[PDB]
Amino acid sequence: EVRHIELPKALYQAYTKATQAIWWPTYSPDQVERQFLSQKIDPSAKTFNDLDLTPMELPDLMFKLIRPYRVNTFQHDVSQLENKEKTFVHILD
Amino acid sequence: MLILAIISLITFVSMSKLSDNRAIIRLINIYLILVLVLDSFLYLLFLNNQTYTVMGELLIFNSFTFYIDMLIYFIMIVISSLYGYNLYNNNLYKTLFEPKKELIILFLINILGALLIVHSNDFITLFVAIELQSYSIYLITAIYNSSYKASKASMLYFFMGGILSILIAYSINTYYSVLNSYTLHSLDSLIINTLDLNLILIALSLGLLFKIGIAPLHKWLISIYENTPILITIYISLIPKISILSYLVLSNISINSLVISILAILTLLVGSVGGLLQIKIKRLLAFSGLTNAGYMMLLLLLNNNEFSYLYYITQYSISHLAIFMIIIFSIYYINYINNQYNPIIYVNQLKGLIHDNAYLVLSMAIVVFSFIGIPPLLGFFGKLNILMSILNNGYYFISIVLIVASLISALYYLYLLNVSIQDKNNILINSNETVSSVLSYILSSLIILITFGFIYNSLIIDIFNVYFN
Amino acid sequence: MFIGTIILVLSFLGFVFNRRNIILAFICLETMLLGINLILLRNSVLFDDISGSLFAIVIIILAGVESAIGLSLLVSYYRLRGVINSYGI
Amino acid sequence: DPIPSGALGQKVPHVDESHQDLLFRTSHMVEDLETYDEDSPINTSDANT
Amino acid sequence: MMYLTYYFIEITIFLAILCTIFIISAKNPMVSILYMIALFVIAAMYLYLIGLGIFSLLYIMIYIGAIAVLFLFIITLLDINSTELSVKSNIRDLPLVLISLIVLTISGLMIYSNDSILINKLLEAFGNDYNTIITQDWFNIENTTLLTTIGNVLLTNNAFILLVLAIVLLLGIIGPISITMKHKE
Amino acid sequence: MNTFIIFIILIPIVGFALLAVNILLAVYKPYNEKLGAFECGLTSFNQTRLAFNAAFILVAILFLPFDLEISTLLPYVMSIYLVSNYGFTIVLLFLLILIIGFVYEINTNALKINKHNKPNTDSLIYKL
Amino acid sequence: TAAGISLTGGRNRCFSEWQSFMHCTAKTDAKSRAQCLPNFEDYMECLHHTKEKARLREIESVLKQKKE
């Protein structure tokens, strides 16, 4: 379960403005400004299909890209494992 | 002698093979016989009911406890004979009944805990002995580790006994918090009628009693007795009961309790009714033991209960051993071996035993009618003495419940006899294998005791009147 | 008196209402013994008495042996079955 | 003539090798009247092998 | 500055409640064992507080040092499946859980007093208001501590229970070998 | 505030100093295979445990009783003078009874690891 | 067996009351045992301090409401 918060603008923008004082990259205030600016595609501009290219889209590649962070907690429904497990040796004498 | 036996058998079994455990059991059986023969003159110490305090004031020795110890030795002798002597010299009976290497040691340690329970005078000794009994009897339930049922019973028994031991320890430490003592000798008339103390004491009594199957906590022990091997069931269904009920009878803890009366009535009704639809033998006998435990719960409300308890526990021990031995003897004639551990499970597998062995069915009839309490047998005199005491002490509703339970239990006691005296096709005509001499003699001796022990009742009362009064 | 009764009662409830584990059963037994020992030792201090501390150290020893035996029994159960499941002891 | 009857006249099963089968596992009868063994030599022939 | 350390018994009671809840609640039983260790630490603290640090150290070296170690030893070696604490599975327990909590706590607090009327038996248990006076005597000439006296009584006045605990420990050796080992012949 | 108390609290609530220094100073930009674990290696959804020899668990189960024995000897060594020549005999009996179990442990060979693939020691006999 | 022993190896806090009560029990029979009621009350009072607690409750209440 990915955690998200959704707290207001005047607070997050100030928190970001504060975290620019550390040396490493952080979420910038202009990024939370861009959080209100959705993509407006220019129709006069060329596209992929002018290059004979057909993109992938995100849901088919999300598996490939996110499976390193998949935990894979345990196996599914270990019931129906009892009587087969009964036939193996578990402590060697 | 027990500790000498334990410290000897540990070494001698460590330095011996698995081919020698049967002979080891024979040796220690003869050891116990010699002890019970040569050292039993110590009864003269308890003339006129002289009581002794030993190990500071941690143990108590009187005629009651000496008798219970002789009884426990007799029981251990019989149970060891069942392991040390082969019924038949066949491959089957060398597959079904084999002693495991450590079984005799655990039996002797459990006997030690039993006796240190009955001889206890301080609660620290009681708790140490309760744990020495219960750990050993967990391991006895578990030693046949190639059985799924036995391992399962081991673990259930561990957890339930653990919880009830928590209860016993809470009771003991609360008694200490109130009185600053671990000794029941610290109580008198004044302390009982000046302090309200019945919650602690009945908590102790119930923590001890639910460890032997007192309702509503009976199903778990009945499952344990069902699921264990037959030659383990015969031990674990009897010796803890003797130990704990003897402690609770010697310690006058529940003299007119309403809770113990209620739970005893419940034990009687459950142990009589629940055994009516049982199709298996060991569950039937477990419910029989439950109702007998109820009969013996009733005399925890008396304050003069030694004769009744000793008579009833002796006769119940003899009957229990006899009936389990008859079920063990009947395996040669059953037509279907169920398991390596419980070769006989269902009562209808005894169908037609009178046509294969008729005198075995005579033994069964004697034991069944002693359980029912039919005169001139021994269970009748047991029930009579119990009724005498409880009616002398004013328990009039419990008496009618006792009669009704005696009647309802007869049905499932008679189930066995009825199916045994039924007709069967494919009877036995010849067999060149003969059952053991020793075990046959032991069973015959128990049956003859049940049948002809009433001759000596006058003598027993005259001895009791000198050693217990 | 309070800490011990609380630990005892909560361990008993976590034993009784355990639909999860067997390890929780073991843990609840051990914590129950702990609670009893704490009540016992508080009374030992208030009365200035040694019998309570003696009973407590005896309980320590006996609980250790109990744990050893219980976890041998579990190992036998696992010898035969190979998996100790949510249910079935 | 034989059908097995109980102590109270009730129906009892005649226990065979018939119903130590995988069919008659996974049924929820009480501990008294189950009849599946779990230690039978029919079921436990391949156990820790 | 004086009363900064007054409520250190109440804090241990609170932390014990918390650690028991975490034992019942933890997903992986390894975490339940670790919270049991934390509860042993809290109990050892409380025992130091009431003046029994010897028992605190004995607890640390026995319970945490051996028993918890063996618990971790077995869960590292055995497959112990677990069902997570759920609302579709455990919420049915709330009525009986609450009834039993109230009844068991109130009876456990009532059982310690000898007063006849039932309500007063709880009210005396909560009567922890008045402080104890600690006066000094000069009669104890030796350096006898709690461990010395435990040894004295256990080896003289109570030698029998020690020589019975010996057989209990013999069981602790002989049982597990009988149950875990398979003897060849 | 004693120096004992100061030290035993200070060690835990300061021990994370270099932890924080390392978390703030050091790089952290993981890969998949930097989050990986080995040169080769894999395992399907076969099981969660491996079969182990009995001695591996028996050493731990037997640590408990022998540890309790040696810890129960502490009251004796702190009471040795007061229990003069009586407790001495008692603890000797204690040690002997507990040596009997150790004898059992040795004679059973409970901590020994046994080998399955034995070397063949049987003669070569040819039916003529 | 370990009764009447302190944490320091000697007599406990409430030894004397217990010893008085036991002297009076040794004097008496089960029919004259009610003479030992005040001694047992003293022993239990030393143990649990109920009466002293009630006394101090009265003192505190006079310090409590008769002033404020």
Ligand SMILES: CCCCCCCCCCCCCCCCCC(=O)OC[C@H](COP(=O)(O)OCCN)OC(=O)CCCCCCCCCCCCCCCCC
């Ligand atoms: C072991 C597992 C670990 C968990 C342990 C939990 C803590 C342990 C709790 C105590 C110990 C358990 C006791 C077992 C129950 C049986 C107790 C018993 O039978 O003793 C009763 C006894 C009187 O019985 P008796 O002596 O036989 O008859 C003569 C009467 N003059 O003595 C008495 O008279 C009893 C005194 C009566 C007061 C009982 C207190 C109950 C108060 C509950 C009130 C709750 C509030 C209302 C309901 C709330 C629900 C929302």
Ligand SMILES: CCCCCCCCCCCC(=O)OC[C@H](COP(=O)(O)OCC[N+](C)(C)C)OC(=O)CCCCCCCCCCC
């Ligand atoms: C004792 C071994 C028990 C093992 C089971 C065998 C039963 C032996 C019965 C002898 C009891 C006794 O004679 O004693 C009578 C006892 C008390 O007397 P005592 O202090 O124990 O002295 C006895 C000294 N002995 C050990 C040297 C003998 O009173 C009782 O309440 C006994 C009630 C038991 C009733 C069961 C009667 C069985 C019929 C006996 C047929 C011969």
